[PDB]
Symmetry: C4
Subunit: 352 residues, 4 copies
């Protein structure tokens, strides 16, 4: 009988139940997976310096993301094609987010439509993750749908001019199961790695800061740059009028040998000088990871793979369980470190 | 036939004879057990710079803890529920301490009573480890019993507003064997982890420095703060009139990802400026560990798990054997490093 | 059915098909193979700081080596006796280089003649790797043949006064398969390790900077010093009128315990002050390795073992496949790091 | 058929042929064997920066130890009870040393007599390793015998007031095979670890610098302090008129957790300011180890365990083979690093 009490248990259970090609697609990093290992190892190098005797009977995990209240600084990151993991895919995910009172970043290519997800999760805090397609009419349609269907921000992914080289996907000749489809667009629906070639056909490798200007003019919605790893690029994003930075290495699935996100976070927080919120994804598996990211000045963190593992175990209930595990680990890490609320999580809590 | 000649052998023997759930309870750290590994690895990073030709024919291991003479700077730390390991539990432990001429820190929740332990070990140096219960009358009763029964200090544990998340205990659904009871208090006797929920019900998560003031007013007994890991908290403990700091991460069982105790010891010794004795626990398994802790300015060290392993092997005789092993390793480490007595163990003996 | 999608797969396939003594000869480093491991591990320590939104739709990999255009900054290094790996040996290699539009460094002892290789690869960019033989007439003949047959530079190997001690070759009592011969010279044709004793008989251990002066006077061809690991030696090579430095530890096959080539590259680039091109070999297995070497100021890199593994798999087609794998990994690493061409690969892309 | 081409092969062969208790006695370090691992690992951290084109056709390995010429800076260290490894024990060893033209340090407790060893090796360079026995008449007799029988120095061991705690020896209840005896003295002949208790009975733990003064007055022979790990002690040895320092941690068999000898060597070389020769033992297994020790300012190195492994394989011939392996590795390391002789091995050859 499954007894899954931490994120790692969910991954182990997912490996046991998913087809190998699908588990490999979800698990993989790029090339030799150096950054994949480092996203996790880096968190272990940051040590915690807990304060005692601070009164933690009433721990308040609540915060805000881009002015929208959330129950905890732990939000769902964009993961493509969620119906591969569970028949309810993105609808299971958004229902879990609504229950938890946190936000869902929806992949511009999901196996579910912008409208279907807003319908399933009307009261959920919802954001759209955008790629800049070679087809700018496709791209504008996605932004307009997001605006009309009550999405609260655009996360524009800037680290994927081309897909990374995930060796298992190349070996398995990965493609979507037959009955599934990217449901916001034939060849654009994703009817070697089939995904790499799909991207080579649909995603624009020419995107530049000029296209960020276009997007900033297209929508008044808050825009976050997702995939920044350098302070100079972070400063450029602020200069282009963007409203946030998601420090991300794409789950270590793009360029291998980039630093862990927790290691580059302080340089990015320093570079933006408090002008915009900074977020982190990559390697978040435990409450202490959330605490270290907030101590180093992230407003909130996003989780990618853990959500897929929850779906694989039991759809909406499995996503809810994963998010509740992270919530309760984060509560306990705050309490044991002497933090009553997120506003008193300070830089002195951590040292590398 | 058991031939146990070092602490690690006692652990291996304990694993072979204890029920898995009990061995797991004793062995575990919190979450991924990063700090548990580091408590041991950290000692190996501190290298010894021995002096030669100093005349070590007459090595004197004796010292004092809070003005009470002990035979060696190696004392028994508080470990709950010792009758799980051996039918004689805390009584076996205190008899061994009396034989060795060292001190026993008694867990405020032992499977034996403050009076039963003072009766078994009348000539033993004995201290009480205190939790601040939500029930302050319970808490005062424990302090008064400790005073009446000849205990020489209070170690107030400050790092446990809630219990840490020990995964094995959650998986094993840990609880005390049926015939046992915390014998100083029904639900307060400890009739997921049952221990985590017990603490959530009995231990006060609201404790603050104000409660330390209350305790300092309640008793004239020496009070040591157990669980401090930051210099600022150590300085606060001194300002509250406390008489010692036990640098402890609770055997790595509370917040995971805190530093090893041997690594934070020098910051704490520096912070208290010689106003109070500083002690260390966490990872002590060898005579050289004791030597490194004293070289970095600890007065004495406490051992937790090694004592449980001694009880598991042969009750009082097994505790005595464990303490004699540590005594003789510590004698040999002093002799080979050129130290005739504890007063000449200096900071130049170690370098990280 | 072989499905070889990265350099490591080619090595694994080579181990499966080559006689053990031949695979061991190709794989080995010197002594305990510390530098062999480090040539690879060192690349992983250099982290990439990619720029986003730079427009990488049109990536241009082309560069030049000593004024000769190449398709990519990835060239074939000298590896002796290539007919052990495949019946077509050096002819397979040069044909693959001609197809790719990159250069081949031909081993002065190949199982194929300077003329045979120029005949097979007339349009290929070709250089000769030279040892200074005790027989200077032999040595001059090789240089003159290289000049007459359209070779564009001399790489003089300076780190092999004697052969390194490769333990497997000593254990296997290594020697060339019977039908093969070093085809540019009986005992000089290579008719414990037979190779070590061959070198002890043919290669001059007395070579000094005076012999570099002799070589500089012998030919007007560009000369590169191969095997430099110190800045002072690099500065000496420039003072002797040489035209390049190949930072090399001989694939970790000579002196064990020297640093990784990627770690010494920056000291050498600094020492030559832009007077000559600096190249690197040792441990190049991935596109990101090429990118890190160019970010640290190498003009191009050479690959040794990967080429042998390509030959072992399928001769010319296997060499072509290996070079195309490296080309495409390097294209993707440039694109994901925001580099449109090799001239914009800058030092800020990397940090150790 | 044994094919032993490096020191490690000799150890592997010794494990295969010796009784477990004897192999364990020879192999062991103290306690958890942290320093034992580090004596070897430390050498790997020191990297070599070889010079090229220096003319190494004529490599001269010769040097001098305390004014006596040797063939190579590689000498035999004192290892007790050599007849356990081979019936010819110390006589096999001294004959091998005479053949090689290097020196033998004879253990004051050997299974062979000071006279027997001088008889077997009349032309060998021979030194006596001395313990200060509680019996000073025993101690004086050994020194006088050494003087009369043509020994050229006294190595006084200063790191063994008591024997280290070698766990395997305690578990195996180690003692000499029955027919053997320490042949320079009943209980003094060595008729838990029997060795630890023997030392507790024969070796004086009270030895101080005052006893060094006594020894300096007893003999005009050169005296080297063996077991120094601190610069202050090295400076004290010079002030007492001693003529050398052997940087040694006793093969990591005494105090565990001391640094590797190669790591403390530079501090000791700096402390003695060129007043006396500094030597190293501990972890020497390869020619590159010898080169790194001389680059950091040791005059010569001693080998302990490798000599025992040679005896175990084939007595005198096995010792000769081990010493010839080290000689030839050291020749090759000098040649590949550009060193014609030991006088040009400089500090720029190494960097940690
Ligand atoms: C299966 C999978 C699919 C992903 N799909 C997308 C995507 O559609 N859009 C996107 O911007 N990022 C995508 N990412 C990256 C994630 O948004 C996120 O940056 C990453 O998963 C965070 O690291 P973690 O998995 O360690 O939590 C995907 C990641 C995974 C593992
Ligand atoms: C089984 C077990 C029970 C413990 N019970 C208590 C307790 O009742 N009170 C307390 O303050 N600390 C308790 N601790 C923590 C110990 O006092 C001590 O800080 C820790 O064991 C020291 O580390 P060591 O086990 O590595 O020697 C316990 C530790 C263990 C392993
Ligand atoms: C099998 C083999 C043969 C080699 N033969 C030569 C040679 O003839 N001349 C030479 O200068 N270097 C020779 N080398 C060294 C290579 O030119 C080159 O420096 C090294 O292979 C680069 O490292 P890599 O194998 O990690 O790519 C050889 C290396 C190998 C593995
Ligand atoms: C089996 C054995 C016996 C030893 N006996 C002695 C001894 O009699 N006197 C002494 O001063 N050192 C003794 N030593 C220490 C050695 O002289 C030397 O310091 C050590 O072996 C050097 O390290 P290595 O074994 O790594 O080469 C002994 C070491 C070993 C391994
Ligand atoms: C890591 N990323 C993916 O696997 C991914 N990222 N963006 C995508 C768009 C479509 C598809 Br299908 C997959 C992805
Ligand atoms: C690590 N700690 C424990 O396991 C512990 N610490 N304090 C306690 C009080 C009661 C019980 Br039961 C167990 C404990
Ligand atoms: C690593 N190097 C070799 O294995 C090598 N290097 N130069 C050579 C010349 C002839 C032969 Br055969 C082999 C080699
Ligand atoms: C490591 N050392 C030994 O094992 C050793 N060192 N000194 C000795 C004297 C007698 C005997 Br037996 C053994 C030893």
């Amino acid at each position: 009988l499954p007894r899954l009490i931490c994120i790692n248990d969910y991954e182990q259970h997912a490996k046991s139940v998913l087809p190998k090609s699908i588990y490999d697609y979800y698990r993989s990093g790029a090339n030799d997976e150096e950054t994949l290992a480092d996203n996790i190892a880096a968190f272990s190098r940051w040590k915690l310096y807990p304060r005692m005797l601070r009164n933690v009977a009433e721990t308040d995990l609540s915060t805000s993301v881009l002015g929208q209240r959330v129950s905890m600084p732990i939000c769902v990151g964009a993961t493509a094609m969620q119906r591969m993991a569970h028949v309810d895919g993105e609808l299971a995910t958004v229902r879990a987010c609504q229950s938890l009172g946190t936000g869902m970043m929806l992949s511009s290519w999901a196996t579910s439509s912008i409208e279907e997800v807003a319908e399933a999760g009307p009261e959920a805090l919802r954001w759209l993750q955008l790629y800049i397609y070679k087809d700018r009419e496709v791209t504008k349609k996605l932004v307009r749908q997001a605006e009309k269907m009550g999405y609260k921000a655009i996360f524009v992914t800037v680290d994927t001019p081309y897909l990374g080289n995930r060796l298992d996907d190349v070996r398995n000749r990965f493609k979507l199961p037959p009955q599934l489809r990217m449901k916001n667009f034939s060849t654009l629906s994703f009817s070697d790695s089939g995904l790499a070639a799909y991207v080579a056909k649909a995603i624009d490798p020419s995107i530049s800061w000029e296209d960020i200007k276009w997007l900033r003019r297209l929508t008044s919605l808050p825009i976050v740059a997702k995939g920044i790893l350098r302070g100079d690029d972070a400063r450029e994003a602020v200069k282009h009028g963007l409203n946030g930075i998601l420090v991300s290495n794409h789950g270590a699935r793009q360029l291998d040998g980039v630093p862990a996100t927790i290691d580059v976070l302080p340089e990015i927080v320093e570079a933006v000088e408090g002008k915009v919120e900074v977020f982190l994804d990559g390697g978040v598996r435990k409450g202490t990871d959330v605490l270290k990211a907030l101590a180093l000045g992230a407003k909130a963190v996003f989780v990618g793979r853990p959500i897929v593992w929850g779906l694989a175990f039991q759809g909406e209930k499995g996503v809810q369980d994963v998010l509740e595990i992270l919530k309760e680990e984060f509560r306990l890490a705050m309490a044991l470190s002497g933090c009553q609320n997120v506003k008193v999580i300070d830089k002195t809590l951590v040292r590398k």
